[PDB]
Design an enzyme around this catalytic site. Sequence first.
Site, PDB file in Angstrom:
ATOM      1  CB  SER A 196      33.749  32.103  26.612  1.00 31.80           C
ATOM      2  OG  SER A 196      35.157  32.154  26.744  1.00 31.80           O
ATOM      3  CG  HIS A 236      36.989  25.008  31.716  1.00 33.54           C
ATOM      4  ND1 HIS A 236      37.739  26.162  31.802  1.00 33.54           N
ATOM      5  CD2 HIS A 236      37.458  24.180  32.679  1.00 33.54           C
ATOM      6  CE1 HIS A 236      38.618  26.039  32.780  1.00 33.54           C
ATOM      7  NE2 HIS A 236      38.470  24.845  33.328  1.00 33.54           N
ATOM      8  CG  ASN A 257      39.970  33.751  20.387  1.00 30.74           C
ATOM      9  OD1 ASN A 257      39.857  34.966  20.248  1.00 30.74           O
ATOM     10  ND2 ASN A 257      39.438  33.090  21.410  1.00 30.74           N
ATOM     11  CG  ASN A 277      47.114  41.184  30.036  1.00 31.00           C
ATOM     12  OD1 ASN A 277      48.141  40.939  30.671  1.00 31.00           O
ATOM     13  ND2 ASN A 277      46.811  42.407  29.609  1.00 31.00           N
ATOM     14  CE  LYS A 308      45.412  47.871  24.824  1.00 30.23           C
ATOM     15  NZ  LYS A 308      44.686  47.236  25.966  1.00 30.23           N
ATOM     16  CD  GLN A 330      47.722  46.082  29.819  1.00 32.64           C
ATOM     17  OE1 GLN A 330      48.026  45.009  30.348  1.00 32.64           O
ATOM     18  NE2 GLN A 330      46.552  46.282  29.220  1.00 32.64           N
ATOM     19  CE1 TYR A 387      47.056  38.389  26.119  1.00 35.63           C
ATOM     20  CE2 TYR A 387      47.378  40.767  26.059  1.00 35.63           C
ATOM     21  CZ  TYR A 387      46.625  39.648  25.750  1.00 35.63           C
ATOM     22  OH  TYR A 387      45.431  39.790  25.074  1.00 35.63           O
ATOM     23  CB  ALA A 399      41.717  48.265  21.760  1.00 41.15           C
ATOM     24  CB  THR A 437      35.518  38.896  26.910  1.00 38.97           C
ATOM     25  OG1 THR A 437      36.654  39.002  27.779  1.00 38.97           O
ATOM     26  CG2 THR A 437      35.769  39.691  25.638  1.00 38.97           C
TER      27      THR A 437
HETATM   28  N1  LIG Z   1      38.828  41.154  25.749  1.00 39.46           N
HETATM   29  C1  LIG Z   1      39.695  42.151  25.244  1.00 39.46           C
HETATM   30  O1  LIG Z   1      39.514  43.297  25.539  1.00 39.46           O
HETATM   31  C2  LIG Z   1      40.873  41.818  24.327  1.00 39.46           C
HETATM   32  C3  LIG Z   1      41.759  42.803  23.969  1.00 39.46           C
HETATM   33  C4  LIG Z   1      42.827  42.525  23.148  1.00 39.46           C
HETATM   34  C5  LIG Z   1      43.005  41.223  22.679  1.00 39.46           C
HETATM   35  N2  LIG Z   1      42.129  40.226  23.025  1.00 39.46           N
HETATM   36  C6  LIG Z   1      42.336  38.888  22.528  1.00 39.46           C
HETATM   37  O2  LIG Z   1      41.137  38.206  22.198  1.00 39.46           O
HETATM   38  C7  LIG Z   1      41.401  36.830  22.312  1.00 39.46           C
HETATM   39  C8  LIG Z   1      40.295  36.181  23.077  1.00 39.46           C
HETATM   40  O3  LIG Z   1      40.359  36.652  24.428  1.00 39.46           O
HETATM   41  P1  LIG Z   1      39.030  36.934  25.297  1.00 39.46           P
HETATM   42  O4  LIG Z   1      39.010  38.348  25.781  1.00 39.46           O
HETATM   43  O5  LIG Z   1      37.782  36.620  24.499  1.00 39.46           O
HETATM   44  O6  LIG Z   1      39.112  35.985  26.521  1.00 39.46           O
HETATM   45  P2  LIG Z   1      37.834  35.042  26.803  1.00 39.46           P
HETATM   46  O7  LIG Z   1      38.640  34.496  28.043  1.00 39.46           O
HETATM   47  O8  LIG Z   1      36.788  35.480  27.909  1.00 39.46           O
HETATM   48  O9  LIG Z   1      37.895  33.546  26.387  1.00 39.46           O
HETATM   49  C9  LIG Z   1      39.105  32.931  26.055  1.00 39.46           C
HETATM   50  C10 LIG Z   1      38.834  31.419  25.989  1.00 39.46           C
HETATM   51  O10 LIG Z   1      40.000  30.732  25.710  1.00 39.46           O
HETATM   52  C11 LIG Z   1      40.079  29.688  26.601  1.00 39.46           C
HETATM   53  N3  LIG Z   1      41.481  29.332  26.885  1.00 39.46           N
HETATM   54  C12 LIG Z   1      42.419  30.164  27.361  1.00 39.46           C
HETATM   55  N4  LIG Z   1      43.569  29.517  27.497  1.00 39.46           N
HETATM   56  C13 LIG Z   1      43.412  28.235  27.111  1.00 39.46           C
HETATM   57  C14 LIG Z   1      44.257  27.123  27.044  1.00 39.46           C
HETATM   58  N5  LIG Z   1      45.638  27.244  27.451  1.00 39.46           N
HETATM   59  N6  LIG Z   1      43.790  25.952  26.605  1.00 39.46           N
HETATM   60  C15 LIG Z   1      42.502  25.807  26.217  1.00 39.46           C
HETATM   61  N7  LIG Z   1      41.646  26.872  26.268  1.00 39.46           N
HETATM   62  C16 LIG Z   1      42.073  28.080  26.710  1.00 39.46           C
HETATM   63  C17 LIG Z   1      39.372  30.155  27.826  1.00 39.46           C
HETATM   64  O11 LIG Z   1      38.938  29.108  28.574  1.00 39.46           O
HETATM   65  C18 LIG Z   1      38.238  30.898  27.263  1.00 39.46           C
HETATM   66  O12 LIG Z   1      37.266  30.064  26.997  1.00 39.46           O
HETATM   67  C19 LIG Z   1      42.734  36.642  22.996  1.00 39.46           C
HETATM   68  O13 LIG Z   1      43.721  36.187  22.127  1.00 39.46           O
HETATM   69  C20 LIG Z   1      43.065  37.982  23.521  1.00 39.46           C
HETATM   70  O14 LIG Z   1      44.387  38.284  23.547  1.00 39.46           O
HETATM   71  C21 LIG Z   1      41.057  40.514  23.855  1.00 39.46           C
END
Ligand SMILES: NC(=O)c1ccc[n+]([C@@H]2O[C@H](COP(=O)([O-])OP(=O)(O)OC[C@H]3O[C@@H](n4cnc5c(N)ncnc54)[C@H](O)[C@@H]3O)[C@@H](O)[C@H]2O)c1
Lengths: 250, 248, 258, 258
Positions: B17, B40, B90, B94, B141, B147, B153, B184, B188
């Site tokens: 996801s 999941h 990945n 947060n 970021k 933040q 985080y 940043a 999602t």
């Molecule tokens: N969305 C943003 O704006 C943003 C900004 C900065 C950094 N990021 C980074 O991008 C990366 C992905 O985040 P995202 O926004 O896509 O979230 P996304 O939640 O919607 O999906 C993350 C996935 O990781 C899985 N997950 C989380 N913790 C887990 C665990 N302990 N064990 C097994 N599975 C686990 C979740 O179930 C989910 O499927 C992260 O590292 C996040 O820090 C995202």
Amino acid sequence: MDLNLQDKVVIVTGGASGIGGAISMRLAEERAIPVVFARHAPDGAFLDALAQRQPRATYLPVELQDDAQCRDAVAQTIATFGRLDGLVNNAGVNDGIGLDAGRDAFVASLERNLIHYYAMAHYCVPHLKATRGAIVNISSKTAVTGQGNTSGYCASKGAQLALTREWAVALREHGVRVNAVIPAEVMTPLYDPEAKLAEIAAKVPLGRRFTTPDEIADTAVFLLSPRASHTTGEWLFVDGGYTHLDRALV
Amino acid sequence: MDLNLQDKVVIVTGGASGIGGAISMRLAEERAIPVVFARHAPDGAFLDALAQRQPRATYLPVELQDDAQCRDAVAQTIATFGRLDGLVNNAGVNDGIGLDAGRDAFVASLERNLIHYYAMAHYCVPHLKATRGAIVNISSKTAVTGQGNTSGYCASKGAQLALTREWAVALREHGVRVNAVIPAEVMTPLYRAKLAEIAAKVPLGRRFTTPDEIADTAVFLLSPRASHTTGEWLFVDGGYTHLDRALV
Amino acid sequence: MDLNLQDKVVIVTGGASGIGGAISMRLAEERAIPVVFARHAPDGAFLDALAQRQPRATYLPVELQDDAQCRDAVAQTIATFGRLDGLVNNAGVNDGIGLDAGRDAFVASLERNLIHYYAMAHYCVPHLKATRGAIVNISSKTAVTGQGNTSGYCASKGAQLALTREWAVALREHGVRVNAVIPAEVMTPLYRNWIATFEDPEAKLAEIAAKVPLGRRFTTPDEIADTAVFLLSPRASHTTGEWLFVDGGYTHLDRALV
Amino acid sequence: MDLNLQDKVVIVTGGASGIGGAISMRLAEERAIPVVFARHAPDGAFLDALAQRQPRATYLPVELQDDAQCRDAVAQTIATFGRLDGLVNNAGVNDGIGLDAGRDAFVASLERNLIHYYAMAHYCVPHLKATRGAIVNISSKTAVTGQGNTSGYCASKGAQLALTREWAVALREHGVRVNAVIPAEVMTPLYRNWIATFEDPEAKLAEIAAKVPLGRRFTTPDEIADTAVFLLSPRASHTTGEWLFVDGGYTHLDRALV
Ligand SMILES: NC(=O)c1ccc[n+]([C@@H]2O[C@H](COP(=O)([O-])OP(=O)(O)OC[C@H]3O[C@@H](n4cnc5c(N)ncnc54)[C@H](O)[C@@H]3O)[C@@H](O)[C@H]2O)c1
Ligand SMILES: NC(=O)c1ccc[n+]([C@@H]2O[C@H](COP(=O)([O-])OP(=O)(O)OC[C@H]3O[C@@H](n4cnc5c(N)ncnc54)[C@H](O)[C@@H]3O)[C@@H](O)[C@H]2O)c1
Ligand SMILES: NC(=O)c1ccc[n+]([C@@H]2O[C@H](COP(=O)([O-])OP(=O)(O)OC[C@H]3O[C@@H](n4cnc5c(N)ncnc54)[C@H](O)[C@@H]3O)[C@@H](O)[C@H]2O)c1
Ligand SMILES: NC(=O)c1ccc[n+]([C@@H]2O[C@H](COP(=O)([O-])OP(=O)(O)OC[C@H]3O[C@@H](n4cnc5c(N)ncnc54)[C@H](O)[C@@H]3O)[C@@H](O)[C@H]2O)c1
Ligand SMILES: [Cl-]
Ligand SMILES: [Cl-]
Ligand SMILES: [Cl-]
Ligand SMILES: [Cl-]
């Protein structure tokens, strides 16, 4: 340059030797009141020199990995002095925990380095808010350069730089500044030895020599002072050019 | 541009996801074999779209905070495919653990974010050495901007940037490259007026970055087209981190 | 990965040799139309290989330090193609102008390096806006590491990084992205000849290569080109203002490693 | 904290107004001997306050864009004092030369900003060696953040950061340190004499100050000065090549914060 730190109460973790010791001593010279948090009682010579500069300087025995000891020592500091004006997070050890070590060793390294920086900030911040005090986090060039067999320490030191930015943001409306100092090679009592010393020193661009604890201390204490009143969130490299200058230079 | 990732086996944590899912999907499109490690089961439409591009793509149920599940899921992957060519760290969240939260909450944040990046690298590196594979760490970021109420985080994300440099050093002689991508604002799953306010602050186009944008840089970094890039932090953020805060 | 650069017209300055030549060749391979601006006529073999991949690719003789020649060559490119999709500012030379050299030498170095990056962007940007095109500036690790007797080139390369941020801000509303690539040690036939001026060429090469953390080897022009062309493409559609280091770890990894 | 700058001779360009003026005043407070190079005669009240702290402080009329005036002014300073301990490159102006302005405007901006930092270092460095002195270059956050219609100034300010690294390498064996200070928003009466031009001058001031994370206010010249003078002193004896941001969090803290 008056730093206006007279009678300012500043906790320095690992503050009785090496870099921390030099920070405590410069604070004492500036007539601040350093409060050393350390696992082991400072040596007599250190305490003699410190008290000569600042008779009210003190030491508290603290195992920083014990959250309750951190809490109680901050409380004792407040009970003794009535205020807290600064926190220098400095205690740490490069414990050489690499990629092959595994989870438990990695987390133990985080406990030795990263987690007590947070715990100390956690317990100190309410007091720092009341005085519009300041925080300095001592990190390490390894946070940005890597080293090769020290994931635990590197992760910790990098997290400390990130927390410097985070806390600067979090505390901005309270006037609490948060900055970091990044040393590279600093000679301490601690740190073919004729040859390997020469080998390491040779790689420092400015003068081909180690940085002294006093040099780290002078920048750290400047950052605690109101002379740096609009500096927050910053990472100051005090490293003789180690991190940023051409690797090819001799 | 042929990325030469065909039949390359790449684990993607949180890979079903958001950004992770986009990375898995791009890997499949390049004919690589993404192996999804996630808590999941992925939804069916995702699995079907993935299988359409790469029938050999795989999902394993993993709680990344369980060190044994990490170890066993990697072992499974090696047993199934005989090789590992990439690791994308990945998974993360947060969790808004600030200065007042205290030790237990702070450490729980490290477990949710930082510690499994290390655990996964620990278990994958011997296999990556065998293939001269690559690692990509997805950070945030916030690691460099802060933040305001997310010590846990932020610390984790910053440690991940540091580890990117450390592992690049550690693995240099083995031909294993380690890089990071720093997003940043990316729309999602759980992210979706409060919208517009955030989007307005992104310099390029005043819009969120897409998961596909993050994925395209992440997959480029996994490939031999980036064969002399290691230890780097690539910002894919529409200018969020580095462009004048005063711009509108 | 489809970079969506088919029939995109991209000017590459110093684009027939070394890094620039590799970028032009990669552009042709991605079905883009590279337009080489260079002082010297390219190798016949280079032209043959370029035409083999992209029959529409062109070369124009341009002395980039001549503002009117930059102007006129951009105008000719627009006349031929009717559009411009990319600019790669790449021409430059480390001319070893130290702090002791004085004003005239320093300014001459700016002319050889910095000033034509600005001139080229000045003449290209009005056209890039119409196509939501992109700019890549090739800088140098020396912009951030220093070197020791090259103030002119260092200043120029650092100004190029600063302008990368500036132009990214300036052009954001037009969808024109601007990024930089920072090489460290890249083996080119030119570098190869400079190395040949040393007493023990083999040993000199090894001495330089020994300092590159990843593999103790030079970066190839193709390695620089692949990142540069990625940055020109909409695959990097939310990357702007960035400095991408493609350097085997030269700039950022521990100086102490062997 | 003793900075050990007593009787140290330090040239400050643009050193009688704004940031430069604050640097001179702090130098005099530390009993150093500031030597002001500036185009205009300083305020009498400035000269009086300076003289009260340091009777030996001097001012020389210098147009910094004239290489011979830089040369002669440094020579006069050596003739008067017999030594040089520091150089603060500070004079500059954000002249708003955009992408569309063209070569002549861009080059003139480099002359107003970049080229005299080089000229001053060129003439001062031979003397700084003998005293193991130091240089501070005042840059601007625009060097790294961009702004949008100021290519000339941005390029200049970025070249100054690059030259800080280069001169740090060049001078390492002579014990001469070179560092930069990067301000963001600093209130000077001159900035005020630019803000004055707006329909609602205080609403404009407010829009700018609201963006500064720490206290939502402008940095003061004294705040810039105190970091700059620290960098000149042996208290910063192992700091070289560094860029110190003194900006209330402007460059590095989350753009989303209020
Ligand atoms: N969305 C943003 O704006 C943003 C900004 C900065 C950094 N990021 C980074 O991008 C990366 C992905 O985040 P995202 O926004 O896509 O979230 P996304 O939640 O919607 O999906 C993350 C996935 O990781 C899985 N997950 C989380 N913790 C887990 C665990 N302990 N064990 C097994 N599975 C686990 C979740 O179930 C989910 O499927 C992260 O590292 C996040 O820090 C995202
Ligand atoms: N010395 C270097 O070359 C160098 C380089 C880069 C960074 N640093 C950083 O400088 C800081 C200071 O290091 P130093 O070299 O002076 O170290 P040091 O080992 O000489 O002194 C550290 C002190 O902290 C104390 N300490 C350590 N862990 C503790 C704990 N858990 N509880 C209580 N006390 C504890 C030690 O007993 C010692 O008194 C560290 O954060 C280090 O990472 C040092
Ligand atoms: N080779 C490396 O190790 C290295 C390292 C760092 C940065 N770089 C950068 O890469 C870019 C390209 O360098 P390269 O190594 O390929 O050099 P190169 O000399 O092999 O090729 C440069 C080309 O530009 C042309 N050129 C130069 N000045 C010109 C002018 N004024 N008008 C027209 N044409 C001109 C040259 O004739 C040549 O064809 C430069 O910006 C350089 O600063 C190279
Ligand atoms: N004020 C800010 O917000 C700000 C922000 C970022 C950077 N800076 C930097 O700080 C430095 C000082 O700026 P300031 O705001 O104090 O400027 P200022 O305009 O208040 O003072 C500059 C002084 O330099 C002198 N000067 C300028 N050009 C000259 C020349 N060619 N010959 C001789 N003298 C000359 C001017 O007359 C004036 O006395 C500059 O380098 C600027 O880029 C300022
Ligand atoms: Cl010391
Ligand atoms: Cl998407
Ligand atoms: Cl090649
Ligand atoms: Cl002031």
